């Protein structure tokens, strides 16, 4: 059950344990009962070193969980800027859709992370993307009172 | 069966979040493996997504008139590309989140009605899938 152990170590941010498991043949793409991989867990918990090791060892940067959630959605939502950059460099899909048709730009805009919104924009994020209910990132930014982000999205 | 599961999970989450106290479904520890399984699964699912489903619930801006349609739209979205056990857990987490949001906006009738709509959705939509997938006994095996 190396896969289960890799999932646990990735979430807990145990760098040494992750390298040993990988060197012992753990499946870098193992999925838990919600469809999350080690990359999803490390991205959400903000462990940058583990994200980089997983990618170097073949982790699927675009893997999606049960609702379509990708590691970039989680990094964007939680506001981990360095992980967002690393994921984008590795081929992360800026336009992936999850849950209700949320795009990583929707999640960064709602959570008020301005620099991440800008990075996503520079990498091709669709400013006009609508979730299932018609809302764009601009709409979510404003509704959560993030004016700074709203203005940036309007200009874009 | 289904009604009891919904009542237990929603009751448990409302108590967990401090919205309600005292006698009723969801009060005290799970009486039943199915109920324990859904509590544990909902809890784990929710710690991952943090405020995601509470934020979605709020984004709907439900009114007593629109709430059923909005609930139904979200549920349909969650089940896009077919049901699996994880999407079912999301559906319970969202239902409980919508009940909590209704408490926030002081629509108390919706706390009960959303639970009614959850049962009806399960029975009329996901019933066929659940049964063929091994029923709730299988869910319990995997998530308990």
From Swiss-Prot, chain B:
Topology relative to the lipid bilayer, per the entry, is: Peripheral membrane protein
What organism does the UniProt record list as the source? Bos taurus
Give the protein family: Belongs to the Bcl-2 family.
Q: Which residues of the full protein are shown?
A: 9 to 152 of 193
Motif BH4, residue range(s) on this chain: 1-21
Q: Name one GO cellular component term.
A: mitochondrial outer membrane
GO biological process, alphabetically ordered: extrinsic apoptotic signaling pathway in absence of ligand; intrinsic apoptotic signaling pathway in response to DNA damage; positive regulation of apoptotic process; release of cytochrome c from mitochondria
Q: Which UniProt keywords apply?
A: Acetylation, Apoptosis, Membrane, Mitochondrion
> Record's domain comment?
The BH4 motif seems to be involved in the anti-apoptotic function. The BH1 and BH2 motifs form a hydrophobic groove which acts as a docking site for the BH3 domain of some pro-apoptotic proteins. The C-terminal residues of BCL2L2 fold into the BH3-binding cleft and modulate pro-survival activity by regulating ligand access. When BH3 domain-containing proteins bind, they displace the C-terminus, allowing its insertion into the membrane and neutralizing the pro-survival activity of BCL2L2.
Spell out the subunit comment: Interacts with HIF3A (via C-terminus domain). Interacts with BOP.
- Kindly state the positions of the motif BH2 in this protein: 128-143
Task: Output this protein's name.
Answer: Bcl-2-like protein 2
Q: Where in the cell is it found?
A: Mitochondrion membrane
What is the gene called? BCL2L2
The superkingdom of the source organism is Eukaryota
Q: Where is this motif: BH1?
A: 77-96
